[PDB]
Paper text:
The structure of huIgG4σ1 Fc includes residues A237-L443 and G236-S444 for chains A and B, respectively, that were modeled into the visible electron density. For the huIgG4σ2 Fc structure, residues S238-L443 and E233-S444 were modeled for the respective chains. The results of our in vitro and in vivo studies demonstrated that huIgG4σ1 and huIgG4σ2 are more silent than huIgG4 PAA. Structures of huIgG1 in complex with FcγRI and FcγRIIIa have shown the importance for L235 in receptor engagement. All Fc variants demonstrating this kinked conformation commonly share mutation of a conserved proline at position 238 and have an altered ability to engage Fc receptor. The Ab1 huIgG4 PAA shows a first transition at 69.5 ± 0.1 °C, while the huIgG4σ1 is at 62.0 ± 0.2 °C and the huIgG4σ2 is at 61.2 ± 0.6 °C, suggesting that the huIgG4 PAA is more thermally stable than its variants.
To assess the impact of the silencing mutations on the structure of the Fc, crystal structures of the Fc fragments of huIgG1σ, huIgG4σ1, and huIgG4σ2 were determined to resolutions of 1.90 Å, 1.90 Å, and 1.85 Å, respectively. Crystal structures and simulations of these Fc variants reveal altered conformational preferences within the lower hinge and BC and FG loops relative to wild-type IgG, providing a structural rationalization for diminished Fc receptor engagement.
Author numbering:
A (entry chain B): 236 to 444
B (entry chain A): 237 to 443
The structure:
């Protein structure tokens, strides 16, 4: 049953800051009530590690169980491309299913980050859009946030990365703000976190001309 | 089971009275010895027989693929009728059904804005012209670029992204030589969507 194990990477922001906790997550679905205990062995570059935390089976609303195992990884190990392998078995049975994941391969490329004010036509509205164009980046793992006056501005949404013709990625993030706050000269800033940035972070600010 | 896919009509087809929208049922991983793949088609549960099915074509992995196309009425798709494909093999009992319809909900008009390149990008040989399309529902949309009446090809568009208010937005990025932008050429983003007048709007961008 190999189409029922899924292995997920850490969130981009978690791998870029050593104070955060990046985790690789091995999920087993379609677990039967007649299945003996689900068991996990984890390996980093083929060497077994023992710090994973496995949660008890959780029943889903389709008469199956789901079992999750979570492994904390060393930021540097993930970014250096180490391979993470989850081996799933049932207690007292011999067979197993194995899944592997690692960061995408290829030379990392630094994102270029541009901020764009609202279209003049949008200035007629009650709220305006501030746009952050992030391009030229590789791999696609990236985090984008906005702030103003120290505080996180959370009325924003960000597109998934999109693959460009030269093999790098781009995306846009759109922050929506009251026109009054923009008209008043408030400074807004787009922060971007990516492994190929110096100190893994950059920011670009934008305010009324 | 996972080997059948059912695709919606193209955004432009449902929106132009001159075009013909259709839904497309596709079956893959069809073994060489498999009996004839058959299709039954239903519109809101009612069987229809006007579909047109194409014979099995081999793929690089030595499996086969079969395709059935059903023409749909514009109003049927736009009114939210459900299209069901039922795939089976001649003389065998099982069947696999897939259904598709337009997302339900009050349609909402796309607000379309064009943005010039960032001043910081102006130092490069090529620059980015941006078209923001937001506030639209459902997500079916077509976005194109032109200059001086003529289609431009060097652009990429993000998929529609679900916004916190339940509508969608996207961005389209047209890459042009710095010299063409500085020459004062006029660029235009065009958007087709059901909640636009004439189903079409165009916004210009120039220096
Ligand atoms: C019974 O129910 C269960 C449970 O479902 C739930 O309950 C039922 C009752 C319904 O209510 C249902 O709606 C509920 O969701 C069913 O279980 C599901 O089983 C299917 C398979 O049958 C699984 O399908 C895969 O989904 C993957 C994506 O999963 C994520 O996204 C969906 C939403 O889009 C979420 O619902 C999932 O939970 C996953 O969400 C992610 O979860 C991660 C782990 O927790 C999160 O990461 C962690 O997050 C924490 C913070 O929270 C930390 O940050 C950690 O550091 C971090 O690790 C992550 O953030 C979160 N994301 C989101 C967006 O929420 C698909 O990737 C996968 O597709 C692959 O495989 C397909 C083949 O099946 C193939 O078609 C795809 O192309 C893709 O193939 C892969 O492609 C890549 C490259 O393209 C290759 O490299 C791969 O090799 C290749 N793999 C292949 C080919 O195998 C599947 O579609 C589904 O995930 C699972 N749901 C849950 C909740 O577990 C079950 O099926 C039901 N049984 C029945 C009906 O019989
Ligand atoms: C053997 O080979 C064959 C052939 O593949 C080719 O050869 C091999 C060797 C490879 O090199 C391969 O790269 C080659 O392409 C393999 O066949 C493939 O099989 C996989 C499954 O394993 C199929 O994957 C699904 O793809 C869906 C999208 O497919 C489209 O987009 C891809 C681009 O990546 C194209 O390749 C496809 O052709 C599809 O393209 C679309 O085609 C439509 C009709 O042909 C077009 O619409 C029509 O267009 C015409 C134009 O002439 C008219 O305008 C008509 O009016 C119009 O209707 C359409 O434009 C076109 N799109 C584009 C972009 O061009 C995925 O959607 C799908 O994912 C879903 O399903 C997964 C499993 O069920 C699931 O895990 C996913 O999460 C996802 O789930 C769905 O999600 C949506 C929303 O996200 C929900 O709405 C659904 O409910 C939900 N379903 C669920 C949950 O069940 C699949 O990943 C692949 O399409 C197929 N290729 C081809 C060419 O058919 C075969 O697998 C090989 N065998 C092996 C390896 O063993």
């Amino acid at each position: 049953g190999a189409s029922s194990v899924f292995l997920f990477p850490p969130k981009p922001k978690d791998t870029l800051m050593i104070s955060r906790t990046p985790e690789v997550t091995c999920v087993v679905v379609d677990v039967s009530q007649e299945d003996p205990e689900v068991q996990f062995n984890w390996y980093v570059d083929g060497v077994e590690v023992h710090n994973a935390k496995t949660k008890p089976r959780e029943e889903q609303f389709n008469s199956t169980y789901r079992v999750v195992s979570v492994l904390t990884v060393l930021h540097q190990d993930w970014l250096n491309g180490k391979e993470y392998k989850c081996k799933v078995s049932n207690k007292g049975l011999p067979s197993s299913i194995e899944k592997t994941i690692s960061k995408a391969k290829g030379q990392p490329r630094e994102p270029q980050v541009y901020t764009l004010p609202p279209s003049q036509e949008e200035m007629t509205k009650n709220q305006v859009s501030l746009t952050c164009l992030v391009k030229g980046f590789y791999p696609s793992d990236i985090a984008v946030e906005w702030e103003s006056n120290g505080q996180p501005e959370n009325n924003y949404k960000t597109t998934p990365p999109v693959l460009d013709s030269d093999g790098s990625f781009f995306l846009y993030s759109r922050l929506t703000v009251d026109k009054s706050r923009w008209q008043e000269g408030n400074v807004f800033s787009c922060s971007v976190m990516h492994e190929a940035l110096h100190n893994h972070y950059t920011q670009k600010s934008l305010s009324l001309s």
